[PDB]
Design a protein around this ligand. Structure first.
Ligand code: CLA
Ligand code: CLA
Ligand code: CLA
Ligand code: CLA
Ligand code: CLA
Ligand code: CLA
Ligand code: CLA
Ligand code: 3PH
Ligand code: XAT
Ligand code: C7Z
Ligand code: LUT
Lengths: 227, 41, 231, 160, 221, 74
C-alpha cells in the first residue's frame, strides 16, 4: 500500500496490502469476496503472464521478421514451414487443444483445492513445493530465482504483467486502427506526429470484413465500429 | 384471491356471466345450425 | 492419494471404500448414490465390458482375415449358411434362456446356480457377476488383480467400440484401415481437420454409410446415428 | 458540435448538431450507427431499467441493494443517508471532499453548475427549434453581428 | 432470507410465499396464488407446464435441427398438416379423439392424485405411484412421484441435498423452457421461419436481423 | 386526400403554409410587433357559411378560439 492508485483515494477495507502489487485499486467492488478475490488474483496472474508472453512474441517477431504483420501472421499462407507435412489449421489445433486441456485441468484442480495436485502422476514422490497459489515453482522455477525476497519479486512480476496487459491492448488497437506493426507505429509517429496520432487513425478499421481459412470463413472484427 | 372469487360468485357477476354464457351458446348453435323451424331428427 | 480418476480430487461418498473392482471414484452425476442401483449398474458395466471386449476382438480379427468386408455393413453382406429369420429366432430363444438366468441370479444371489438337467451338478457359491467354476476353468493369477485388469480392458474396449462405430460412420472403412489412413497424414485426418464450426459457417463431414440399405427385399433404415448434429 | 467545427471529428458541423443525431428522425438522422436507433433504444431500455430500478429501490429502502448477489457489485451499492449522494466505493472513487464543510461547498458547486446546465439545455432545445442550427453555431453567429442575430431579429425566420 | 425477484422490496406477498417452495423467489405481484388451496393447485400446474414445455421445446429444437440436415421432417408449425397429408388414411377426428382419450386416462389418474394425494398408489397400480409428496409439507402424492417407474434410475432417492439440487435444476429449466416456447411462437408469428433457422440467421448477421427488422414487432418500420 | 401533405409537413415548414396562406411568410414578427392586421388572411371576421361545404369558415373559428382563449386567460 503506502501510496494508492489515486492521490487522495480511500483504500477499501479488504485491500490491506497483504497481496503483492495491490495499490488500493478496485473501484468496482469486485474483490469484496475473499473467494472471488483469490479467483481473480489467479486470473490476473494468468492474464499477465500470457500477456507478457504475447507482447514478447510481438516485439521479437517484428524485430526478427519485420516483413510479417503480427496481426495476420496466423493465416495459413504466412505460416513458416519446417517439414513437408501439408498445412492444416484443424490439425494444428488438435495438438494445442489436447495439450492445453491437460495442463489447464491440472492448474484448475490446483485452484479448486490448493496443495492437492503437486506430485507426478507416475512417480508420486516428485512434488512441486508451491508456496502460494499461482506460484508453483520447483520444476516451474528450475533456475532457482526464488528463495530470496519473494514479495518484492512477486510485485516485480505483477507490475510487469499489468504493464504487458495494457501494452497488448495497445498492440491490438494500434494494429486494428493503423494496420502496421507496433515498432513500425513508433517509427511512424516519430516522423510526422501531427498527422500520425490516435486522431485520424481512429475511426478506420484496417481489418478485412472476413477472412477465408482454406474454405472456412471467419467474420473477424475491430473492437470498435470504426469505418 | 379468495375474496376475488367470492366477488365472482356474487349474484350481479355470476348472473351476468351465466346469461353471457347461455347467450353465447345460443348464438353459436344458431350460427352452425341456422333457420331450424322444427325438431328434424 | 490413492488411485483417482483426477489426481488431487476427493471421492464422493458412495464411491469411498468401494468393494467393486475398478473403483477410481468417477460418477460425476451421482448415479451410484443408491445402493441397489449401484449393484445393478456394476453388473451392467461388467456385461457391457465383456460384450464390448468380444465385439472389438471380433471386429479386429474379421478385419484382419477378411479386409474386403466392411464390419458395419457386414450384417447384410456376409452370405449366411442358414436363413436370417430362423437364425434370429434361435438367437432370441438361446439368449432369453441364458440372460434370464443371469439376471435372476443377480436379483437374488442364491438362486440360478443348479443345473436343471443334472441334479448333482451345481455352481459353487459365487459373488454376483463372477460365476467361476465351470465358467472359470483356468485362473492366471490373483483374482482381485485380474478383476481389475478385466475392468480396465473392458473400459478400453467399450471406448474402442464406440470409436469403431464412429470412424465407420465418418470414414467408411474398417478400424485398421482408418488407422493406416490417419498414419500417412496425421495432420489432416484428425476430426479437427474434417469438421469445424464457427459463427457464420459449419463444415461437417459426409456420412459414408448410405441413407438406406437393401436386404432380401426390405430396407433397413441404416443411416448414420444422428447426422446434422455432427460438428 | 465544437469538435466538428474544430474539424477534429469527421462530420460537417451541420450534421454533428445534437438534434440531427437520430433522436428525432424527422428532424434529421445519422444513419451510420452500428445498429439502427430502435435496437439501440431496446438495449438502452433494458440497461437503464436495471440501473434506474435499482436506484429507486435504494431510495425506498435506504440500505438495500447491497444484500443480494450481483456478481460482487453489491459491495458498492450500500449508499448513504441522503439518496442523492450515495458516494460509496464507486460513486465517490476519488474520495473528494473529505471535510463535511468542504462536502457542502462541493455540493453547492454541483447544484449551481447543474442548474446552469438545466437552463442551458432548455435554451439549446429552444434555439434548435427557433434557429434550426447548432448551439455553438448560434453562439458564433450571435457574436458575429449581435444587433441583427438575436432573439428579436430571428423572429421573422423561425422554422426556415 | 433468500434471493428475491426484486432485490430489496421485502413487501413480497405475505408469508404464503416464504422460502419453502422449490423455485420460490417471491414472484406473485398479482396475487394469483394467495390462498393455500389455490397455491397447491398452482404448484401442480407450474411443474406440469414446465415439464410439458420442456418436452415440447426439446422436440421442436430437435425437429428443427433435423430439418436443417435435409431430413424429411417438417417444421414444428406445419408438422400436423404435413403428417395428415403424408398419411391420408388417418382421420383427423379419430386422431384427435384418441389423443383426448389416452391423454384423459393418465390425466384422470393425475387428477385423482390431486384430489386425494395418496389414493392412486393402490388398486390396479402398485404402490410406487403413491407419490413422495413434496410441497406444502405433504409426504405423499404431489407433482413429484418417485418410485421405480417415474424415477427409474433413482436420481432423487438418497441424499436429500442431491434431491433438492435436482429439483432446482428441474424447476429452473422448466421456467426457461416455458419462456423459450413463448419465444418460439412469437418468432414464428413475426418472421415465419423455424427457431434454429432464426438463430442461424441471427448469428450469420447479428445486425439487420433483430426484432426491429422483421416488420411486425416495431410495426411501422 | 391521399395526395395532400401530412399535417406535420404543413406544421414544420412555413413554406407550404406560405403558398397557402401568405402571411406565414412573415412568421411571428407581426404578432410581437402588434401588426396583427397582417394575419387577416387566416384570422378573418366573415360569418355566414362556406359556399362549398355549408359550414362556418375555419378561419373564423380560428379567430374565435384565439379571441376567447385570450379572454379566458384574462
Ligand atoms: C484480466 C485482468 C485482471 C484481473 C482479473 C485483475 C484482478 C484483480 N486486480 Mg488488477 N489490473 C489489471 C488487470 C486485472 N486485474 C491491469 C491491466 C492493471 C493495470 C492497470 C491492473 C492493476 C491493478 C491494481 C493497482 C490493483 C489491482 C487489483 C486487483 C484485485 C482486486 C480487484 C478486483 O477484485 O476486481 C477484479 C477485476 C476484474 C474482474 C477485471 C475485469 C475487467 C473488466 C470486466 C473489463 C474492463 C476493461 C478494461 C477497463 C479495459 C482495459 C484496457 C485499457 C487499459 C486500454 C483483483 C484480484 C488490486 C489488488 O492488487 O488486489 C489485491 C490493486 O491494487 N489491479
Ligand atoms: C519479467 C516478468 C516476470 C517476473 C519478474 C517473474 C517473477 C517470478 N516468477 Mg514468473 N513467469 C513469467 C514472468 C515473470 N515472472 C511469465 C511470462 C510466465 C509464463 C511462462 C511465468 C510463469 C511462472 C511460473 C509458473 C512461476 C513463476 C514464478 C516466479 C517467481 C519466482 C521465479 C523467479 O524469481 O524468476 C525470475 C524472473 C525473471 C528473472 C525474469 C526473467 C526474464 C526473462 C528470462 C528474459 C526475457 C526472455 C523472453 C522470453 C523474451 C518470481 C517472483 C515461480 C514461483 O512463483 O515460484 C514459487 C512459478 O512457479 N513464473
Ligand atoms: C466523447 C464521445 C465520442 C463518441 C460517442 C464518439 C462516437 C463516434 N465517433 Mg468519435 N471522437 C471523439 C469522441 C467520441 N466519438 C473525440 C474526442 C475525438 C477526437 C480525437 C474523436 C474522433 C473521431 C474520428 C476521427 C472519427 C470518429 C468517429 C466516430 C463514430 C464511429 C466510432 C469510431 O470509430 O470513433 C472512435 C471513438 C472514439 C475516438 C472515442 C474515444 C474518445 C474518448 C477519449 C473516449 C470516450 C462514432 C459515432 C469516426 C466516424 O466519423 O465514423 C464515420 C471517425 O472517423 N471520432
Ligand atoms: C481380458 C478380459 C477379461 C479378464 C481379465 C477377465 C477376468 C475374469 N473373469 Mg471374465 N470374461 C471376459 C473377459 C475377461 N475376464 C469376457 C469377454 C467374457 C464374455 C465371454 C467373460 C465372461 C466371464 C464369466 C461368465 C466369468 C468370468 C470370470 C472371471 C474371473 C475369474 C475367471 C478368470 O480368471 O478368467 C480368466 C482370465 C482371462 C481368460 C483373461 C485372458 C483373456 C483371454 C485369454 C483373451 C482371449 C484370447 C483369444 C484367443 C483372443 C476373472 C477375474 C468368472 C468369475 O467371475 O469367477 C468367479 C465367471 O464366471 N468371465
Ligand atoms: C461540475 C459538476 C459536478 C460537481 C461539482 C459534482 C460534485 C460532486 N459529486 Mg457529482 N455528478 C456529476 C457532476 C458533478 N458532481 C454528473 C454530471 C453526474 C452524472 C454522471 C454525477 C454523479 C454523481 C454521483 C452518483 C455522486 C456524485 C457525487 C458528488 C460529490 C462527491 C465529491 C466529488 O467527487 O466532487 C466532484 C469533482 C468534480 C466534479 C470536479 C471534476 C470536474 C471534471 C470535469 C470531471 C470529469 C470526470 C473525469 C474526467 C472522468 C474520469 C475521472 C476518473 C474516472 C478517474 C460532489 C459534491 C457523489 C457523492 O455525493 O458522494 C457522497 C455521488 O454519489 N456525483
Ligand atoms: C402457466 C405457467 C406457470 C404457472 C402455473 C406458474 C405458477 C407459479 N409460479 Mg411461475 N413462472 C413461469 C410460469 C408459471 N408459473 C414462467 C414462464 C416463469 C419465467 C418468467 C416463471 C417464473 C416464476 C418465478 C421467479 C416465481 C414463480 C412463482 C410461481 C408460484 C407463485 C406465483 C403464482 O402462484 O402465480 C400464478 C401464475 C399463474 C396462474 C399464471 C397466470 C398467467 C397470466 C394469467 C397470463 C399472463 C402471463 C403471460 C405473460 C401472458 C402471455 C399470453 C399471451 C401473450 C400469449 C406459482 C405456483 C414464484 C414461486 O415462488 O414459485 C413457488 C416465484 O418465485 N414463477
Ligand atoms: C397553444 C397554441 C399554439 C401552439 C402550440 C403553436 C405552435 C407553433 N406555432 Mg403558432 N399560433 C398560434 C398558436 C399556437 N402555435 C395562434 C393562436 C396564432 C395566431 C396569432 C399563431 C400564429 C403562428 C404563426 C404566424 C406562426 C406560428 C408558428 C408556430 C410554430 C413555431 C413556433 C414555435 O415553435 O414556438 C413554440 C412555443 C411553445 C411550444 C411554447 C413555448 C412558448 C409552432 C409549432 C410559426 C410557424 O412555424 O408556422 C407554421 C409561424 O410563423 N404560429
Ligand atoms: C386482474 C386482477 C386479478 C386479481 C386476482 C386476485 C387478487 C387478489 C390479491 O391480489 O390479493 C390482494 C393483495 C393482498 O393479498 P390478500 O391478503 O390475500 O388479500 O393486495 C395487494 O397487495 C395488492 C392488491 C392489488 C391486486 C392487483 C390489482 C390488479 C392489478 C392490475 C391493475 C390493472
Ligand atoms: C405448455 C407449454 C408448451 C408446450 C408445448 C407443446 C406441447 C408443443 C407441442 C408440439 O411442438 C411439438 C412438440 C411438435 C410440433 O410439431 C407440434 C406441437 C403441438 C406444436 C408452454 C407454456 C408456456 C407458458 C408460459 C410462457 C407462461 C408464462 C407465465 C408467466 C410469465 C407468468 C408470470 C406471472 O404469473 C406469475 C408467475 C405471478 C403472477 O402474479 C404475475 C405473472 C406475471 C402473471
Ligand atoms: C377442460 C380442459 C381440456 C379438455 C377437457 C375435455 C373437454 C375432455 C373431454 C373431451 C371430449 C369428449 C372430446 C371429444 C372430442 C371430439 C372431437 C374433437 C371430434 C373431432 C372431429 C372433427 C372436429 C371433424 C372431423 C372431420 C374431417 C376433417 C373429415 C370428414 O370426415 C369430415 C369431419 C367428420 C367433419 C384440455 C385442454 C384437454 C386439458 C385440460 O387441462 C382443460
Ligand atoms: C483492475 C480492475 C478492478 C476494478 O474493480 C474494475 C476494473 C477497473 C475494470 C479493473 C481494471 C481492469 C483492467 C484494466 C483490465 C484489463 C485487462 C487486460 C488489458 C488484459 C489483457 C490481456 C492480454 C492478453 C491475455 C494477451 C495475450 C496475447 C497473446 C497470447 C498473443 C499471442 C500471439 C502472439 C504472441 C503473436 C502471434 O503473431 C499472434 C498471437 C497468437 C495472437
Amino acid at each position: 500500500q503506502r501510496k494508492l492508485w489515486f492521490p487522495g483515494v480511500a483504500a477499501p477495507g479488504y485491500l490491506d496490502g497483504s497481496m503483492a502489487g495491490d495499490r488500493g485499486f478496485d473501484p468496482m467492488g469486485l474483490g469484496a469476496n475473499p473467494k472471488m478475490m483469490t479467483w481473480y488474483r489467479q486470473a490476473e496472474l494468468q492474464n499477465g503472464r500470457w500477456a507478457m508472453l504475447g507482447v514478447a512474441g510481438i516485439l521479437g517477431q517484428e524485430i526478427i521478421n519485420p516483413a510479417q504483420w503480427w496481426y495476420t501472421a496466423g493465416m495459413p499462407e504466412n505460416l513458416p514451414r519446417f517439414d513437408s507435412q501439408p498445412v492444416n489449421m484443424g490439425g494444428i489445433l488438435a495438438w494445442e487443444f489436447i495439450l492445453m486441456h491437460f495442463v489447464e485441468v491440472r492448474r484448475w484442480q490446483d485452484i479448486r483445492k490448493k496443495d492437492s495436485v503437486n506430485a507426478d502422476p507416475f512417480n508420486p514422490n516428485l512434488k512441486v513445493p508451491n508456496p502460494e497459489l499461482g506460484y508453483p515453482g520447483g520444476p516451474f522455477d528450475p533456475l532457482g530465482f526464488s528463495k530470496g525476497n519473494f514479495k518484492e519479486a512477486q510485485t516485480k512480476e505483477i507490475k510487469n504483467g499489468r504493464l504487458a496487459m495494457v501494452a497488448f491492448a495497445a498492440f491490438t488497437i494500434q494494429a486494428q486502427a493503423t494496420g502496421k506493426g507496433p515498432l513500425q507505429n513508433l517509427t511512424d509517429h516519430l516522423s510526422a506526429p501531427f498527422s500520425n496520432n490516435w486522431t485520424t487513425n481512429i475511426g478506420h478499421c484496417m481489418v478485412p470484413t472476413s477472412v477465408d481459412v482454406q474454405g472456412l470463413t471467419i467474420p473477424l472484427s475491430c473492437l470498435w465500429p470504426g469505418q | 384471491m379468495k375474496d376475488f372469487t367470492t366477488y365472482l360468485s356474487t349474484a350481479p357477476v355470476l348472473t351476468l356471466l351465466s346469461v353471457t354464457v347461455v347467450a353465447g351458446l345460443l348464438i353459436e348453435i344458431n350460427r352452425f345450425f341456422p333457420d331450424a323451424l322444427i325438431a328434424a331428427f | 492419494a490413492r488411485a483417482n480418476w483426477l489426481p488431487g480430487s476427493d471421492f464422493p461418498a458412495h464411491l469411498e471404500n468401494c468393494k467393486l473392482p475398478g473403483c477410481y471414484g468417477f460418477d460425476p452425476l451421482g448415479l451410484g448414490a443408491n445402493e441397489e442401483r449401484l449393484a445393478w449398474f456394476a453388473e451392467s458395466e461388467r456385461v457391457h465390458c465383456r460384450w464390448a471386449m468380444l465385439g472389438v476382438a471380433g471386429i479386429l480379427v474379421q478385419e484382419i482375415v477378411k479386409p474386403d468386408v466392411f464390419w458395419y455393413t457386414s450384417g447384410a453382406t456376409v452370405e449366411l449358411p442358414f436363413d436370417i429369420t430362423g437364425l434370429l429366432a434361435f438367437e432370441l430363444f438361446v439368449m432369453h434362456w441364458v440372460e434370464s438366468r443371469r439376471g435372476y441370479d443377480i436379483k437374488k444371489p442364491g438362486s440360478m446356480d443348479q443345473d436343471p438337467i443334472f441334479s448333482n451338478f451345481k455352481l459353487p457359491a459365487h459373488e454376483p457377476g463372477y460365476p467361476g467354476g465351470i465358467f472359470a476353468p483356468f485362473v492366471p493369477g490373483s483374482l482381485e488383480e485380474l478383476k481389475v485388469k478385466e475392468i480396465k480392458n473392458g473400459r478400453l474396449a467399450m471406448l474402442a467400440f464406440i470409436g469403431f462405430t464412429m470412424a465407420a460412420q465418418v470414414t467408411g472403412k474398417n478400424p485398421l484401415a482408418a488407422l493406416r489412413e490417419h498414419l500417412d497424414n496425421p495432420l489432416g485426418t484428425t476430426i479437427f481437420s474434417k469438421a469445424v464450426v464457427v459463427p457464420g459457417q459449419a463444415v461437417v463431414p459426409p456420412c459414408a454409410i448410405p441413407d438406406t440399405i437393401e436386404f432380401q427385399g426390405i430396407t433397413i433404415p441404416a443411416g448414420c446415428f444422428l447426422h446434422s448434429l455432427w460438428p | 458540435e465544437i469538435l466538428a467545427t474544430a474539424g477534429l471529428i469527421p462530420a460537417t458541423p451541420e450534421e454533428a448538431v445534437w438534434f440531427r443525431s437520430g433522436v428525432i428522425p424527422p428532424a434529421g438522422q445519422y444513419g451510420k450507427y452500428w445498429m439502427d436507433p430502435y435496437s439501440l433504444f431496446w438495449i438502452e431500455a433494458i440497461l437503464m431499467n436495471f440501473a434506474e430500478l435499482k436506484r429507486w429501490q435504494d431510495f425506498k429502502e435506504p440500505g438495500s441493494q447491497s444484500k443480494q448477489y450481483f456478481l460482487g457489485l453489491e459491495a458498492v451499492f450500500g449508499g448513504s443517508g441522503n439518496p442523492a449522494y450515495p458516494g460509496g466505493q464507486w460513486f465517490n472513487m476519488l474520495n473528494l471532499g473529505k471535510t463535511p464543510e468542504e462536502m457542502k461547498k462541493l455540493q453547492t458547486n454541483e447544484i449551481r453548475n447543474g442548474r446552469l446546465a438545466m437552463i442551458a439545455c432548455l435554451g439549446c432545445a429552444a434555439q434548435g427549434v427557433m434557429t434550426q442550427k447548432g448551439p455553438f453555431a448560434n453562439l458564433l453567429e450571435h457574436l458575429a453581428d449581435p444587433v441583427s442575430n438575436n432573439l428579436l431579429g430571428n423572429l421573422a425566420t423561425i422554422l426556415k | 432470507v433468500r434471493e428475491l425477484w426484486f432485490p430489496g422490496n421485502k413487501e413480497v406477498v405475505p408469508d404464503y410465499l416464504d422460502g419453502s417452495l422449490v423455485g420460490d423467489h417471491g414472484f406473485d405481484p398479482l396475487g394469483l396464488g394467495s390462498s393455500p388451496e389455490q397455491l397447491s393447485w398452482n404448484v401442480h400446474a407450474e411443474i406440469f407446464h414446465g415439464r410439458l414445455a420442456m418436452t415440447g421445446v426439446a422436440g421442436i429444437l430437435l425437429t428443427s435441427l433435423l430439418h436443417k440436415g435435409g431430413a424429411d421432417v417438417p417444421e414444428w408449425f406445419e408438422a400436423g398438416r404435413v403428417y395428415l397429408d403424408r398419411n391420408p388414411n388417418v382421420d383427423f377426428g379419430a386422431l384427435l379423439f384418441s389423443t383426448i382419450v389416452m391423454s384423459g386416462f393418465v390425466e384422470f389418474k393425475r387428477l385423482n392424485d390431486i384430489r386425494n394425494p395418496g389414493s392412486q398408489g393402490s388398486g390396479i397400480l402398485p404402490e410406487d405411484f403413491k407419490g413422495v409428496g413434496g410441497p406444502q409439507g405433504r409426504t405423499v402424492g404431489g407433482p413429484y412421484v418417485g418410485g421405480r417407474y417415474f424415477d427409474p434410475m433413482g436420481l432423487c432417492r438418497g441424499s436429500p441435498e442431491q434431491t433438492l439440487k435436482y429439483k432446482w435444476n428441474e424447476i429452473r429449466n422448466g421456467r426457461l423452457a416455458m419462456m423459450a416456447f413463448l419465444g418460439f411462437a412469437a418468432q414464428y408469428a413475426a418472421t415465419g421461419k423455424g427457431p434454429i433457422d432464426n438463430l442461424v440467421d441471427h448469428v450469420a448477421d447479428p445486425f439487420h436481423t433483430t426484432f426491429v427488422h422483421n416488420g411486425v414487432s416495431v410495426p411501422f418500420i | 386526400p391521399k395526395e395532400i401533405p401530412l399535417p406535420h409537413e404543413f406544421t414544420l415548414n412555413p413554406e407550404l403554409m406560405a403558398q397557402l396562406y401568405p402571411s406565414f411568410s412573415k412568421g411571428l414578427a407581426p404578432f410581437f410587433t402588434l401588426d396583427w392586421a397582417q394575419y387577416s388572411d387566416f384570422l378573418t371576421f366573415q360569418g355566414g357559411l362556406n359556399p362549398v361545404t355549408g359550414g362556418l369558415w375555419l378561419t373564423d373559428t380560428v379567430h374565435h378560439h384565439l379571441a376567447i382563449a385570450v379572454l379566458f386567460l384574462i
